[PDB]
Structures are given as C-alpha cells and as structure tokens.
Amino acid sequence: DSCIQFTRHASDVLLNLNRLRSRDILTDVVIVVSREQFRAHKTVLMACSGLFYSIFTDQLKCNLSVINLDPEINPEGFCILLDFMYTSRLNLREGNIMAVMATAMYLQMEHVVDTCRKFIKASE
Amino acid sequence: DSCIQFTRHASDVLLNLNRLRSRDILTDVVIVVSREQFRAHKTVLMACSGLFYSIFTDQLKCNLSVINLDPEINPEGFCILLDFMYTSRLNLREGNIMAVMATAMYLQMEHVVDTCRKFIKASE
Amino acid sequence: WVIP
Amino acid sequence: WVIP
Ligand SMILES: O=C1Cc2cc(Nc3nc(Cl)ncc3F)ccc2N1
Ligand SMILES: O=C1Cc2cc(Nc3nc(Cl)ncc3F)ccc2N1
Numbered sequence: 001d002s003c004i005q006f007t008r009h010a011s012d013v014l015l016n017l018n019r020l021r022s023r024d025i026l027t028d029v030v031i032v033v034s035r036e037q038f039r040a041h042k043t044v045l046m047a048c049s050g051l052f053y054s055i056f057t058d059q060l061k062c063n064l065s066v067i068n069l070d071p072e073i074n075p076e077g078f079c080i081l082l083d084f085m086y087t088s089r090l091n092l093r094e095g096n097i098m099a100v101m102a103t104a105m106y107l108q109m110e111h112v113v114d115t116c117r118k119f120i121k122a123s124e
Numbered sequence: 125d126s127c128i129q130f131t132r133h134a135s136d137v138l139l140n141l142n143r144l145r146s147r148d149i150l151t152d153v154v155i156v157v158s159r160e161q162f163r164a165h166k167t168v169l170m171a172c173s174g175l176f177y178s179i180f181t182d183q184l185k186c187n188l189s190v191i192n193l194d195p196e197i198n199p200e201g202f203c204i205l206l207d208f209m210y211t212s213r214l215n216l217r218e219g220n221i222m223a224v225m226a227t228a229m230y231l232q233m234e235h236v237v238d239t240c241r242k243f244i245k246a247s248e
Numbered sequence: 249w250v251i252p
Numbered sequence: 253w254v255i256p
C-alpha cells in the first residue's frame with residue numbers, strides 16, 4: 001500500500017497497556033502460580049505466549065477468569081516474564097535465569113528461551 | 125534496572141493483537157459509526173485514543189458491549205484509524221485526509237492529527 | 249512518521 | 253536483544 005507509519009506507535013500502545021495493568025483497568029483474568037496471584041489482560045497474554053494463545057482460543061477455557069499454572073512453576077519467574085510481556089524488558093540475573101528459562105519454555109515464549117540459552121552457554 | 129530489551133517485542137505484540145482482531149478472537153466491543161459496525165478490543169482502543177480511554181474508564185460505560193459514535197463521523201475515516209491502531213500504518217490519501225483528520229480529532233489521537241495538519245499545510 |  |  002501507500003501507507004505512512006508512526007515508528008513509536010507499537011511501543012506507545014504497549015506502554016499504555018502496562019499503565020492499564022498497573023491501575024487494574026479492564027484486567028480480565030487472574031493467573032495463579034501456587035500461593036501468588038497475577039492479574040492481566042487475556043489478549044496481551046495470548047499475544048506473548050503460545051501456551052496462553054492455546055488456552056484462550058479453547059472454546060471452554062476462553063471463559064475462565066482464573067487459570068492455575070503447573071505447581072512446578074516459580075512465581076518470581078512468572079512475574080519477570082509477565083513484566084517482559086508488558087514492557088519488552090527482561091530482568092535476567094544469575095540468580096533467576098534457570099527459573100526464567102524453565103517458565104519461558106512452559107509458556108512457549110521462544111525469544112526469551114533463546115536469550116536464556118545464550119546467556120547460560122556464555123557462563124559455561 | 126539491569127534489564128535487557130527485545131527490540132521487536134512491541135511490534136510483534138501489536139501484530140498478534142491485529143491477528144486476534146482479524147480472527148474475531150476475544151473482541152469485546154462493537155463500535156457503531158452510522159450504518160457500519162466495527163468489532164475491536166476495548167484495551168487496544170483505550171491505548172490509542174483519548175476518547176476511548178475516557179469511555180472505558182467510566183464506571184457505567186466500561187460495561188457496554190456497543191458504543192455509538194457521533195453521526196457526523198465518517199465510517200471510512202474510522203476504519204482507516206482503527207487499522208492504524210492495530211498496525212501503526214495510516215492510509216492517508218488526498219480523498220480521505222479531511223475525514224481522517226476530523227475523526228482523529230474526535231477520537232483524540234494527537235499524533236495522527238499532527239501528521240494530517242502537516243500534509244494539509246504542504247498542499248496549501 | 250516514515251515511509252515503511 | 254539490546255541494552256536499553
Ligand atoms: O513464542 C511464542 C510467542 C507466541 C505468541 C502467539 N500468539 C498468537 N499467535 C498468532 Cl499466530 N496469532 C495471534 C496470537 F496472539 C502464538 C505462539 C507463540 N509462540
Ligand atoms: O492522543 C492520545 C492517545 C491517547 C491514549 C490514551 N491512553 C491511555 N493513557 C494512559 Cl495515561 N494510560 C492508559 C491509556 F490507555 C490517553 C490519551 C490519549 N491521547
């Protein structure tokens with residue numbers, strides 16, 4: 001087409017979606033990771049994770065307001081990945097990289113799994 | 125912080141949100157612009173438009189599944205802006221620029237109003 | 249704004 | 253991935 005494009009639009013949209021999350025505006029699901037609860041927007045979770053895309057395209061699961069993750073999932077790992085979904089920034093540290101990588105494999109977030117593998121390889 | 129950032133994340137999120145819109149997945153509102161209807165995600169509309177941000181943060185209006193816009197709004201202008209919200213690309217043409225600018229002023233999309241003003245000034 |  |  002003959003369209004023009006606003007370079008910062010996608011980043012500005014994501015920043016506003018994170019502001020809605022902060023302010024608990026139009027959040028429509030609670031993700032439970034053992035004793036912790038995380039509120040989020042189903043559409044953002046689906047846009048970032050192959051697991052959530054599969055869950056919320058299922059005719060029965062799309063209607064649930066609570067999703068319980070596997071008990072082996074670490075809440076801190078999930079929190080770091082949820083922050084990444086809404087900001088593009090990943091808080092990867094020596095002390096959390098194994099939990100983050102395991103959580104990203106479970107959530108099916110291939111680009112995160114890729115950077116974790118590279119950071120682990122560099123330490124070996 | 126000491127975060128790393130994935131450059132293409134925000135663009136990839138927006139592309140996936142547009143794929144959900146295409147496939148009518150988890151759309152939760154219909155915007156009516158005279159005889160036409162447009163399905164969308166309330167969160168994307170709020171992230172892009174000051175008018176939708178005000179509508180869906182209102183305690184009564186946040187619960188509506190149908191929103192009727194002012195009858196003076198042009199459906200083609202709205203369609204072009206809705207496509208911009210989900211893609212960052214604006215289909216601005218000599219034949220639609222006045223309707224697009226008027227619609228962006230109504231929807232409170234300041235960056236779009238800015239580029240329309242500049243393109244109009246260049247033609248004068 | 250740019251030409252994509 | 254970059255240093256933001
Ligand atoms: O690593 C990843 C990230 C990821 C996100 C999605 N999300 C969607 N995919 C499509 Cl094709 N349309 C809409 C979506 F919301 C699916 C698979 C995967 N795998
Ligand atoms: O030209 C524009 C575009 C636009 C979008 C928004 N959106 C939100 N603003 C904030 Cl501060 N937090 C969350 C949001 F969804 C508000 C005003 C305006 N004016």
Ligand SMILES: [Cl-]
Pocket residue numbers: 048109110111112113
């Ligand atoms: Cl990813």
Ligand SMILES: [Cl-]
Pocket residue numbers: 172233234235236237
């Ligand atoms: Cl704008």
